[PDB]
Protein backbone atom coordinates (compact mmCIF):
# COMPACT_ATOMS: atom_id res chain seq x y z
CA UNK A 597 0.00 0.00 0.00
CA UNK A 598 0.95 3.68 0.00
CA UNK A 599 2.21 3.15 3.54
CA UNK A 600 5.14 1.16 2.18
CA UNK A 601 6.34 4.31 0.42
CA UNK A 602 7.08 6.58 3.40
CA UNK A 603 8.78 5.93 6.75
CA UNK A 604 6.70 3.99 9.27
CA UNK A 605 9.03 4.33 12.26
CA UNK A 606 9.21 7.48 14.32
CA UNK A 607 12.36 9.35 15.22
CA UNK A 608 14.23 7.79 18.16
CA UNK A 609 13.69 11.20 19.78
CA UNK A 610 9.92 10.72 19.93
CA UNK A 611 7.58 9.90 22.79
CA UNK A 612 7.12 6.47 24.39
CA UNK A 613 4.77 4.04 22.66
CA UNK A 614 5.41 5.36 19.16
CA UNK A 615 6.39 3.19 16.18
CA UNK A 616 9.97 2.04 16.50
CA UNK A 617 10.16 3.13 20.15
CA UNK A 618 8.21 0.39 21.92
CA UNK A 619 9.04 -1.60 25.00
CA UNK A 620 8.81 -5.37 24.76
CA UNK A 621 5.42 -5.38 26.48
CA UNK A 622 4.16 -2.68 24.10
CA UNK A 623 5.37 -4.69 21.10
CA UNK A 624 3.53 -7.73 22.44
CA UNK A 625 0.38 -5.66 22.98
CA UNK A 626 0.53 -4.35 19.42
CA UNK A 627 0.81 -7.87 18.01
CA UNK A 628 -2.09 -9.03 20.18
CA UNK A 629 -4.22 -6.01 19.23
CA UNK A 630 -3.66 -6.54 15.51
CA UNK A 631 -4.39 -10.26 15.89
CA UNK A 632 -7.72 -9.50 17.57
CA UNK A 633 -8.75 -7.01 14.88
CA UNK A 634 -7.82 -9.37 12.03
CA UNK A 635 -9.87 -12.10 13.70
CA UNK A 636 -12.82 -9.65 13.79
CA UNK A 637 -12.50 -9.31 9.96
CA UNK A 638 -10.81 -5.89 9.88
CA UNK A 639 -8.33 -5.44 7.04
CA UNK A 640 -7.75 -1.69 6.68
CA UNK A 641 -5.98 0.73 8.98
CA UNK A 642 -4.06 -2.04 10.76
CA UNK A 643 -0.64 -0.49 10.22
CA UNK A 644 1.67 0.12 13.19
CA UNK A 645 1.07 3.88 13.25
CA UNK A 646 -2.70 3.63 13.33
CA UNK A 647 -2.87 0.84 15.87
CA UNK A 648 -0.35 2.45 18.21
CA UNK A 649 -2.36 5.68 18.11
CA UNK A 650 -5.34 3.71 19.44
CA UNK A 651 -3.20 1.85 22.00
CA UNK A 652 -1.64 5.07 23.29
CA UNK A 653 -5.10 6.65 23.51
CA UNK A 654 -6.13 3.86 25.91
CA UNK A 655 -2.77 3.42 27.69
CA UNK A 656 -2.22 0.00 26.10
CA UNK A 657 -5.47 -1.45 27.50
CA UNK A 658 -6.04 -3.80 24.60
CA UNK A 659 -9.76 -4.40 25.06
CA UNK A 660 -10.42 -0.67 25.43
CA UNK A 661 -8.38 -0.05 22.28
CA UNK A 662 -10.39 -2.68 20.39
CA UNK A 663 -13.62 -0.97 21.41
CA UNK A 664 -12.29 2.41 20.33
CA UNK A 665 -11.12 1.04 16.97
CA UNK A 666 -14.38 -0.86 16.31
CA UNK A 667 -16.37 2.30 17.03
CA UNK A 668 -14.12 4.38 14.78
CA UNK A 669 -14.46 1.99 11.84
CA UNK A 670 -18.21 2.13 12.04
CA UNK A 671 -18.21 5.92 12.46
CA UNK A 672 -16.03 6.30 9.36
CA UNK A 673 -18.61 4.34 7.37
CA UNK A 674 -21.66 6.06 8.87
CA UNK A 675 -20.28 9.58 8.45
CA UNK A 676 -18.74 9.01 5.04
CA UNK A 677 -15.15 9.64 6.11
CA UNK A 678 -13.87 6.78 3.94
CA UNK A 679 -15.04 8.57 0.76
CA UNK A 680 -14.91 12.22 1.83
CA UNK A 681 -11.93 13.10 -0.38
CA UNK A 682 -13.36 11.33 -3.43
CA UNK A 683 -16.79 12.89 -2.88
CA UNK A 684 -15.21 16.33 -2.63
CA UNK A 685 -13.25 15.85 -5.85
CA UNK A 686 -16.40 14.70 -7.64
CA UNK A 687 -18.01 18.06 -6.80
CA UNK A 688 -14.88 20.13 -6.50
CA UNK A 689 -15.94 23.33 -8.26
CA UNK A 690 -19.15 23.78 -6.26
CA UNK A 691 -17.45 22.91 -2.98
CA UNK A 692 -14.50 25.24 -3.57
CA UNK A 693 -16.89 28.08 -4.48
CA UNK A 694 -18.57 27.71 -1.10
CA UNK A 695 -15.35 27.16 0.84
CA UNK A 696 -13.75 30.38 -0.39
CA UNK A 697 -16.69 32.35 1.06
CA UNK A 698 -15.53 31.39 4.56
CA UNK A 699 -11.79 31.90 4.09
CA UNK A 700 -11.30 35.66 4.65
CA UNK A 701 -13.53 35.78 7.67
CA UNK A 702 -12.18 32.53 9.19
CA UNK A 703 -8.57 31.92 8.13
CA UNK A 704 -7.53 28.27 8.31
CA UNK A 705 -4.17 27.52 6.71
CA UNK A 706 -1.17 25.26 6.87
CA UNK A 707 2.16 27.01 6.50
CA UNK A 708 5.33 24.89 6.55
CA UNK A 709 6.27 22.70 9.53
CA UNK A 710 7.55 22.85 13.08
CA UNK A 711 11.14 22.01 14.04
CA UNK A 712 10.29 18.31 14.29
CA UNK A 713 8.65 18.24 10.89
CA UNK A 714 4.96 18.33 11.91
CA UNK A 715 2.55 20.18 9.62
CA UNK A 716 2.09 23.67 11.04
CA UNK A 717 -1.55 24.79 11.08
CA UNK A 718 -2.94 28.27 11.82
CA UNK A 719 -6.47 29.46 12.49
CA UNK A 720 -7.54 33.06 13.12
CA UNK A 721 -10.88 33.57 14.88
CA UNK A 722 -11.07 37.33 15.59
CA UNK A 723 -12.60 38.20 12.23
CA UNK A 724 -15.60 35.93 12.67
CA UNK A 725 -18.96 37.69 12.86
CA UNK A 726 -21.29 34.84 13.77
CA UNK A 727 -24.39 36.28 12.07
CA UNK A 728 -22.46 36.80 8.83
CA UNK A 729 -20.75 33.41 9.01
CA UNK A 730 -23.98 31.51 9.38
CA UNK A 731 -25.25 33.11 6.15
CA UNK A 732 -22.55 31.23 4.19
CA UNK A 733 -22.02 28.02 6.20
CA UNK A 734 -23.68 25.81 8.79
CA UNK A 735 -22.16 24.26 11.89
CA UNK A 736 -22.31 20.76 10.45
CA UNK A 737 -20.73 21.97 7.21
CA UNK A 738 -17.80 23.36 9.21
CA UNK A 739 -17.53 20.05 11.04
CA UNK A 740 -17.42 18.17 7.74
CA UNK A 741 -14.75 20.58 6.45
CA UNK A 742 -12.71 19.63 9.48
CA UNK A 743 -13.13 15.88 8.93
CA UNK A 744 -12.17 16.32 5.29
CA UNK A 745 -9.03 18.09 6.46
CA UNK A 746 -8.25 15.26 8.87
CA UNK A 747 -8.41 12.90 5.91
CA UNK A 748 -6.24 15.18 3.76
CA UNK A 749 -3.78 15.37 6.64
CA UNK A 750 -3.50 11.59 6.84
CA UNK A 751 -3.52 11.00 3.06
CA UNK A 752 -1.19 13.78 1.81
CA UNK A 753 0.45 15.75 4.59
CA UNK A 754 1.69 12.83 6.70
CA UNK A 755 3.36 11.01 3.78
CA UNK A 756 5.12 14.11 2.47
CA UNK A 757 6.28 15.33 5.86
CA UNK A 758 7.48 11.84 6.77
CA UNK A 759 9.49 11.51 3.56
CA UNK A 760 10.98 14.93 4.24
CA UNK A 761 11.94 14.14 7.84
CA UNK A 762 13.14 10.60 7.13
CA UNK A 763 10.89 9.33 9.93
CA UNK A 764 7.17 9.00 10.54
CA UNK A 765 5.33 12.24 11.30
CA UNK A 766 1.93 11.46 12.83
CA UNK A 767 0.89 14.71 14.51
CA UNK A 768 0.04 18.38 13.94
CA UNK A 769 1.37 21.63 15.44
CA UNK A 770 -1.48 24.14 15.85
CA UNK A 771 -1.44 27.91 16.38
CA UNK A 772 -4.87 29.35 17.17
CA UNK A 773 -5.02 33.19 17.04
CA UNK A 774 -7.85 34.55 19.21
CA UNK A 775 -7.07 38.26 18.81
CA UNK A 776 -10.29 40.16 19.07
CA UNK A 777 -12.72 37.39 20.03
CA UNK A 778 -15.56 37.84 22.49
CA UNK A 779 -15.78 35.33 25.35
CA UNK A 780 -19.59 35.45 25.12
CA UNK A 781 -19.27 34.39 21.48
CA UNK A 782 -16.96 31.57 22.57
CA UNK A 783 -19.64 30.48 25.04
CA UNK A 784 -22.29 30.63 22.34
CA UNK A 785 -20.30 28.23 20.12
CA UNK A 786 -19.48 25.75 22.90
CA UNK A 787 -21.78 23.15 21.35
CA UNK A 788 -19.76 23.35 18.10
CA UNK A 789 -16.51 23.03 20.05
CA UNK A 790 -18.00 19.98 21.77
CA UNK A 791 -18.88 18.43 18.40
CA UNK A 792 -15.33 19.04 17.18
CA UNK A 793 -13.90 17.59 20.39
CA UNK A 794 -16.10 14.49 20.29
CA UNK A 795 -15.15 13.53 16.74
CA UNK A 796 -11.50 14.43 17.25
CA UNK A 797 -11.04 12.71 20.63
CA UNK A 798 -12.92 9.55 19.71
CA UNK A 799 -12.02 8.96 16.06
CA UNK A 800 -8.67 10.75 15.57
CA UNK A 801 -6.61 9.65 18.59
CA UNK A 802 -3.04 10.81 19.09
CA UNK A 803 -3.02 13.26 16.18
CA UNK A 804 -2.34 16.34 18.31
CA UNK A 805 1.30 17.28 18.72
CA UNK A 806 1.26 20.78 20.16
CA UNK A 807 -1.55 23.36 20.40
CA UNK A 808 -0.70 27.00 21.01
CA UNK A 809 -3.36 29.62 21.70
CA UNK A 810 -2.15 33.20 21.12
CA UNK A 811 -3.64 36.67 21.53
CA UNK A 812 -6.41 35.31 23.73
CA UNK A 813 -8.49 37.67 25.87
CA UNK A 814 -7.33 38.15 29.46
CA UNK A 815 -10.17 35.91 30.69
CA UNK A 816 -9.71 33.14 28.12
CA UNK A 817 -7.61 30.88 30.34
CA UNK A 818 -10.49 30.60 32.78
CA UNK A 819 -13.18 30.51 30.10
CA UNK A 820 -11.26 27.51 28.71
CA UNK A 821 -12.19 25.55 31.83
CA UNK A 822 -15.58 25.17 30.07
CA UNK A 823 -13.86 23.34 27.23
CA UNK A 824 -11.65 21.05 29.32
CA UNK A 825 -14.46 18.55 30.19
CA UNK A 826 -14.69 17.76 26.48
CA UNK A 827 -10.97 16.88 26.35
CA UNK A 828 -8.85 14.24 27.97
CA UNK A 829 -6.06 15.38 30.35
CA UNK A 830 -3.44 14.15 27.87
CA UNK A 831 -4.85 16.51 25.25
CA UNK A 832 -5.06 19.39 27.73
CA UNK A 833 -1.39 18.88 28.60
CA UNK A 834 -0.52 19.73 24.97
CA UNK A 835 -2.45 23.05 24.95
CA UNK A 836 -0.45 26.17 25.79
CA UNK A 837 -2.21 29.49 26.25
CA UNK A 838 0.49 32.10 25.66
CA UNK A 839 0.83 35.68 26.90
CA UNK A 840 2.51 38.78 25.52
CA UNK A 841 5.91 37.00 25.14
CA UNK A 842 4.39 34.43 22.76
CA UNK A 843 6.62 35.13 19.73
CA UNK A 844 9.78 33.79 21.31
CA UNK A 845 7.79 30.89 22.77
CA UNK A 846 6.63 29.84 19.30
CA UNK A 847 10.23 30.08 18.07
CA UNK A 848 11.28 27.34 20.52
CA UNK A 849 9.10 25.00 18.48
CA UNK A 850 9.03 26.48 14.95
CA UNK A 851 11.88 27.62 12.65
CA UNK A 852 11.90 31.39 12.32
CA UNK A 853 11.82 31.11 8.52
CA UNK A 854 8.63 29.03 8.72
CA UNK A 855 6.66 31.39 10.95
CA UNK A 856 4.73 34.32 9.44
CA UNK A 857 6.13 37.77 10.16
CA UNK A 858 3.00 38.73 12.07
CA UNK A 859 3.61 35.92 14.57
CA UNK A 860 7.32 36.52 15.09
CA UNK A 861 9.03 34.91 12.09
CA UNK A 862 10.39 35.86 8.69
CA UNK A 863 8.07 33.94 6.37
CA UNK A 864 6.55 36.00 3.56
CA UNK A 865 4.48 34.66 0.68
CA UNK A 866 6.29 34.67 -2.66
CA UNK A 867 3.82 37.23 -3.95
CA UNK A 868 3.46 39.45 -0.87
CA UNK A 869 0.01 40.60 -2.06
CA UNK A 870 -1.32 37.07 -1.60
CA UNK A 871 -3.30 36.14 1.48
CA UNK A 872 -2.49 33.49 4.08
CA UNK A 873 -6.16 32.58 4.27
CA UNK A 874 -5.96 31.21 0.69
CA UNK A 875 -2.62 29.48 1.25
CA UNK A 876 -1.48 25.88 1.67
CA UNK A 877 2.33 25.79 1.65
CA UNK A 878 4.44 22.93 2.96
CA UNK A 879 6.27 19.67 2.08
CA UNK A 880 3.10 18.28 0.45
CA UNK A 881 3.83 20.89 -2.29
CA UNK A 882 7.44 19.73 -2.78
CA UNK A 883 7.71 17.24 -5.67
CA UNK A 884 10.54 15.44 -3.88
CA UNK A 885 8.16 14.43 -1.11
CA UNK A 886 4.92 13.86 -3.01
CA UNK A 887 4.57 10.14 -3.58
CA UNK A 888 2.23 7.73 -5.35
CA UNK A 889 -0.73 9.26 -3.53
CA UNK A 890 -0.29 12.27 -5.82
CA UNK A 891 -0.63 15.90 -4.83
CA UNK A 892 -3.18 17.19 -2.36
CA UNK A 893 -6.22 18.91 -3.97
CA UNK A 894 -6.38 22.67 -3.72
CA UNK A 895 -9.14 23.59 -1.25
CA UNK A 896 -9.39 27.22 -2.39
CA UNK A 897 -9.61 26.34 -6.08
CA UNK A 898 -7.91 28.80 -8.40
CA UNK A 899 -7.28 31.08 -5.42
CA UNK A 900 -5.05 28.57 -3.63
CA UNK A 901 -1.60 30.00 -2.85
CA UNK A 902 1.07 27.29 -2.85
CA UNK A 903 4.23 29.48 -2.72
Ligand SMILES: CCCCCCCC/C=C\CCCCCCCC(=O)O[C@H](COC(=O)CCCCCCCCCCCCCCCCC)COP(=O)(O)O[C@@H]1[C@H](O)[C@H](O)[C@@H](O)[C@H](O)[C@H]1O
Nearest residue numbers: 653724781782785793796797800801802803804828830831
Ligand atom coordinates in the same frame (compact mmCIF):
# COMPACT_ATOMS: atom_id res chain seq x y z
C1 LIG B 1 -18.19 28.34 15.07
C2 LIG B 1 -16.89 29.10 14.84
C3 LIG B 1 -16.01 28.97 16.08
C4 LIG B 1 -14.91 27.95 15.86
C5 LIG B 1 -14.06 27.94 17.12
C6 LIG B 1 -13.62 26.52 17.43
C7 LIG B 1 -12.71 26.04 16.30
C8 LIG B 1 -12.02 24.75 16.79
C9 LIG B 1 -10.58 25.13 17.21
C10 LIG B 1 -9.50 24.44 16.69
C11 LIG B 1 -9.77 23.32 15.71
C12 LIG B 1 -8.43 22.64 15.36
C13 LIG B 1 -8.27 21.39 16.26
C14 LIG B 1 -7.65 20.31 15.35
C15 LIG B 1 -7.25 19.07 16.21
C16 LIG B 1 -6.33 18.21 15.33
C17 LIG B 1 -5.61 17.10 16.15
C18 LIG B 1 -6.65 16.20 16.81
O1 LIG B 1 -7.60 15.80 16.23
O2 LIG B 1 -6.40 15.80 18.17
C19 LIG B 1 -7.36 14.98 18.71
C20 LIG B 1 -8.14 15.82 19.70
O3 LIG B 1 -8.64 16.95 19.00
C21 LIG B 1 -9.52 17.76 19.78
O4 LIG B 1 -9.84 17.41 20.91
C22 LIG B 1 -10.09 18.98 19.07
C23 LIG B 1 -10.58 19.98 20.09
C24 LIG B 1 -9.34 20.69 20.65
C25 LIG B 1 -9.77 21.81 21.60
C26 LIG B 1 -10.41 22.96 20.77
C27 LIG B 1 -10.00 24.24 21.50
C28 LIG B 1 -10.96 25.37 21.11
C29 LIG B 1 -10.82 26.42 22.25
C30 LIG B 1 -10.66 27.81 21.61
C31 LIG B 1 -11.99 28.13 20.92
C32 LIG B 1 -12.70 29.25 21.70
C33 LIG B 1 -12.70 30.52 20.85
C34 LIG B 1 -14.00 30.58 20.07
C35 LIG B 1 -14.27 32.00 19.61
C36 LIG B 1 -15.42 32.02 18.64
C37 LIG B 1 -15.41 33.37 17.93
C38 LIG B 1 -16.74 33.54 17.19
C39 LIG B 1 -6.78 13.82 19.47
O5 LIG B 1 -6.20 14.30 20.71
P1 LIG B 1 -4.88 13.60 21.24
O6 LIG B 1 -4.51 14.28 22.52
O7 LIG B 1 -3.83 13.57 20.18
O8 LIG B 1 -5.32 12.09 21.53
C40 LIG B 1 -6.15 11.79 22.64
C41 LIG B 1 -7.19 10.78 22.21
O9 LIG B 1 -7.95 11.35 21.16
C42 LIG B 1 -8.09 10.44 23.40
O10 LIG B 1 -8.99 9.40 23.05
C43 LIG B 1 -7.30 10.00 24.61
O11 LIG B 1 -8.23 9.85 25.68
C44 LIG B 1 -6.23 11.01 24.97
O12 LIG B 1 -5.46 10.51 26.04
C45 LIG B 1 -5.33 11.27 23.79
O13 LIG B 1 -4.70 10.05 23.43
